C-alpha cells in the first residue's frame, strides 16, 4: 500500500486500486510514485496552477469499469486551460468550446459511424463508462503551458508501466487505439498477439488530412471487439451533457 500522502488515494475505485497496486507501491522504481507526488507538491509550493484538479487526475481509471475494460485510447498530456480537462484524454468539460482535435474526431465519427450525431459539447465520460480507458501519457499540466510536465513529472514512466501491466495482466483481451507517432511508440509495450493494436494518423489539423479523415477507426475498433466476442462501443454521445 503506497506511502504517498495523497496521490494514491485519488484512485478510488477498488478494482483499479488493487490492479494498480504493484505500480503505486513504494517499491516500484524505488519510490517513483512518491516522487511524482513530491513533484506535484513542489509545483504547488511554487505557486503553479496544476490541471486537472486533484480529484480528476485519475478519472480515466475511476470512471472506467475494470472488469468491463475493452478499449484503451492514449493521449499525450491534458488540455491546459482552466476548467477544461477532467482526466480523460481528448475530453473537455461541458460548456467549453471543442478543441480542434476533438472537432476532427467528431467529423470522422460522423462519416464512419452510420447515424452518429456530434454533440455541441466535448464531454466524453460516457465512453469511459462503457469500458474505454482514456489515458494520457502525462496526467497533469501547468496552466496554459502544453507539455510542461512531460519531461519533469515522471508520469510517463507510470503510464508506460500501466500499459505494460494491462497488456500482461488484464483479464480481458483489449483493443488499443494509437493515434499519432507519440502514442504509436507504446506499441512495443503491448502484446499484439493477445491484444489488437489499431494505429492511425493523429486527428489534430497538422496531420488530419494526411490520413485521419476516412480512416474509419471507430468502426474498425468495433469490428475488432465483435470478433473478440466483446460488446461494441456505443459511440453516440449524449447530446445534453451532465
Ligand atoms: O487529453 C488530451 N487532449 C488532447 C490531446 Br491532442 C491529447 O493528447 N490528450
Ligand atoms: Br486539440
Amino acid at each position: 500500500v503506497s506511502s504517498s500522502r495523497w496521490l494514491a488515494g485519488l484512485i478510488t475505485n477498488p478494482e483499479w486500486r488493487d490492479f494498480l497496486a504493484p505500480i503505486t507501491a513504494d517499491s516500484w522504481r524505488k519510490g517513483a510514485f512518491i516522487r511524482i507526488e513530491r513533484f506535484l507538491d513542489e509545483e504547488k509550493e511554487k505557486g503553479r496552477v496544476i490541471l486537472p484538479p486533484a480529484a480528476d487526475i485519475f478519472n480515466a481509471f475511476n470512471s472506467c469499469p475494470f472488469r468491463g475494460l475493452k478499449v484503451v485510447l492514449l493521449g499525450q498530456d491534458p488540455y491546459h486551460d482552466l476548467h477544461q480537462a477532467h482526466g480523460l484524454c481528448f475530453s473537455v468539460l461541458p460548456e467549453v468550446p471543442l478543441p480542434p482535435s476533438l472537432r476532427n474526431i467528431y467529423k470522422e465519427l460522423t462519416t464512419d459511424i452510420a447515424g452518429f450525431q456530434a454533440p455541441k459539447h466535448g464531454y466524453l465520460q460516457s465512453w469511459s463508462e462503457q469500458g474505454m480507458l482514456m489515458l494520457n501519457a502525462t496526467l497533469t499540466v501547468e496552466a496554459h503551458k502544453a507539455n510542461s510536465h512531460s519531461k519533469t513529472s515522471g508520469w510517463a514512466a507510470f503510464t508506460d508501466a500501466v500499459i505494460q501491466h494491462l497488456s500482461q495482466h488484464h483479464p480481458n483481451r483489449l483493443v488499443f487505439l494509437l493515434w499519432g507517432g507519440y502514442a504509436q511508440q507504446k506499441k512495443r509495450l503491448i502484446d499484439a498477439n493477445r491484444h489488437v493494436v489499431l494505429e492511425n494518423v493523429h486527428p489534430s489539423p497538422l496531420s488530419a488530412n494526411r490520413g485521419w479523415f476516412g480512416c474509419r477507426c471507430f468502426s474498425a475498433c468495433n469490428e475488432a471487439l465483435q470478433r473478440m466476442s466483446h460488446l461494441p462501443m456505443h459511440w453516440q454521445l449524449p447530446l445534453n451533457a451532465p
Side-chain angles (χ1 to χ4, degrees):
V1 184
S2 174
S3 296
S4 64
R5 264 199 309 126
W6 55 270
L7 191 60
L10 294 173
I11 300 160
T12 58
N13 176 261
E15 293 174 298
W16 280 109
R17 287 184 74 107
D18 287 346
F19 180 78
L20 297 169
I23 315 176
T24 60
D26 300 338
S27 290
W28 174 71
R29 295 295 185 271
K30 295 184 164 199
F33 192 82
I34 284 162
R35 284 187 296 278
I36 298 165
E37 176 175 274
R38 184 182 67 197
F39 173 79
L40 295 172
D41 287 344
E42 288 166 3
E43 297 302 296
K44 179 190 176 173
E45 178 75 36
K46 291 173 179 165
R48 296 179 174 169
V49 175
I50 306 311
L51 306 169
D56 293 339
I57 286 173
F58 292 114
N59 180 41
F61 300 115
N62 296 324
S63 63
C64 180
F66 175 78
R67 285 182 268 97
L69 179 67
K70 61 195 178 190
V71 177
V72 177
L73 176 62
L74 305 185
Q76 192 164 336
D77 73 338
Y79 297 118
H80 50 74
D81 196 6
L82 300 176
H83 318 137
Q84 182 180 56
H86 66 108
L88 305 181
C89 67
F90 297 97
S91 187
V92 295
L93 291 169
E95 301 299 311
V96 173
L98 297 177
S101 284
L102 190 52
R103 285 203 302 250
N104 285 341
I105 288 164
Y106 286 180
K107 284 189 174 74
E108 181 62 19
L109 277 161
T110 300
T111 58
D112 185 23
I113 299 297
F116 179 86
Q117 179 55 56
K120 296 308 198 226
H121 67 83
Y123 184 70
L124 308 176
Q125 187 102 353
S126 62
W127 289 350
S128 176
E129 292 169 349
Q130 299 177 50
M132 181 167 179
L133 182 68
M134 292 177 80
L135 186 65
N136 281 316
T138 299
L139 297 177
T140 52
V141 61
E142 184 177 348
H144 308 314
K145 304 185 179 180
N147 297 321
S148 42
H149 282 186
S150 62
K151 303 316 195 163
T152 48
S153 65
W155 281 122
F158 176 83
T159 60
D160 280 358
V162 169
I163 294 161
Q164 294 178 85
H165 202 62
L166 287 168
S167 175
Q168 184 76 33
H169 290 283
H170 200 276
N172 297 344
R173 299 177 63 208
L174 306 174
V175 172
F176 290 85
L177 306 180
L178 305 181
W179 300 342
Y182 188 93
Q184 285 162 20
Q185 286 171 339
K186 317 303 183 174
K187 187 176 59 147
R188 73 199 212 295
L189 300 180
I190 300 160
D191 178 343
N193 286 348
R194 175 173 162 72
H195 306 290
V196 172
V197 178
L198 298 172
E199 301 182 280
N200 286 103
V201 169
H202 191 277
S204 83
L206 177 91
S207 46
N209 278 292
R210 308 192 285 191
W212 171 258
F213 300 124
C215 77
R216 304 205 72 186
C217 55
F218 305 96
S219 64
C221 180
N222 276 353
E223 288 193 47
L225 288 171
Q226 200 157 330
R227 167 72 186 99
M228 315 160 36
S229 284
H230 271 292
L231 180 63
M233 290 293 301
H234 177 87
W235 294 110
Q236 183 64 60
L237 294 156
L239 294 172
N240 289 315

